């Protein structure tokens, strides 16, 4: 996260870390939505341009962290995956549209004060919080600069930007399943996500029922905290039916 600060213990209980086995390295972030499901960005698992195509057998999910490199004995849980689901229409050829994937854990996880799930948004909450200017929060153990890795989970709060602006900042085709957030060069405030944060949650706190809802996933961007550029996130609500369908079709 660039120009973000250290998180508080138990501030983002749903933050997951996708860790690889050999080599043992961080890959992406992800969120915990039920005791068996993790939600991440499909390009953390499959990105053919770089021959990336991970399978169950290759990842570990570390839930409960704060620290990036330390096995927080007695605080974090490490699960194995049972099945990975990528959106059947994830487009890795053109603009990372439908950049979402679901992973089912081998066994359910036990929640604590460090592990708790986030809510997935409902049409009404989506409608009322996704307005330009409303701030959302992103977290991750990603880089701190474009080109400088943090020991702790970072947090930055970013404003939603207007689609026209999101579109007049890039040459990529933005679709309805994306949204962007970030300050304008003009608003003398920085922050953004960066490499290592892909797959994590973008959440907002409903002022109506004091709950945190995950509205987006870190998908892509061009650089990290560049002026005139913004970060794009997958539109969770817009892909929520997919979510439900694979959950009730394959478990809970």
């Amino acid at each position: 996260i660039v120009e973000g600060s250290d998180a508080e213990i138990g501030m983002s209980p749903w933050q997951v870390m996708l860790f690889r086995k050999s080599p043992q390295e961080l890959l992406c972030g992800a969120s915990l939505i039920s005791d068996r499901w993790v939600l991440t960005a499909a390009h953390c698992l499959l990105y053919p341009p770089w021959d990336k195509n991970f399978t169950e057998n290759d990842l570990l999910v570390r839930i409960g962290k704060h620290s990036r490199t330390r096995y927080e004995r007695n605080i974090e849980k490490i699960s194995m995956l049972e099945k990975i689901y990528i959106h059947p229409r994830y487009n890795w050829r053109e603009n990372l549209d439908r950049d979402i994937a679901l992973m089912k854990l081998k066994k359910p996880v036990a929640f604590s004060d460090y592990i708790h799930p986030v809510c997935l948004p409902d049409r009404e909450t989506a409608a009322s919080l996704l307005q330009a200017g409303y701030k959302g929060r992103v977290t991750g153990w990603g880089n701190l600069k474009e080109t400088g890795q943090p020991s702790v989970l970072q947090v930055v709060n970013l404003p939603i930007v207007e689609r026209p602006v999101c579109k007049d900042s890039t040459r990529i085709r933005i679709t309805d399943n994306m949204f962007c957030a970030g300050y304008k060069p003009d608003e003398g405030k920085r922050g953004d996500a960066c490499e290592g944060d892909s797959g994590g949650p973008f959440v907002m706190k409903s002022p109506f029922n004091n709950r945190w809802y995950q509205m987006g996933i870190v998908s892509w961007g061009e650089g990290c905290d560049r002026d005139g550029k913004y970060g794009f996130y997958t539109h969770v609500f817009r892909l929520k039916k997919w979510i439900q369908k694979v959950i009730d079709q394959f478990g809970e």
Binding site: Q24, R70, Y71, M80
Partner: peptide, 11 residues
């Protein structure tokens, strides 16, 4: 850079 994790999580 990461600290070792308990062998029972690799198998």
């Amino acid at each position: 850079d990461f600290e070792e994790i308990p062998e029972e999580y690799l198998q």
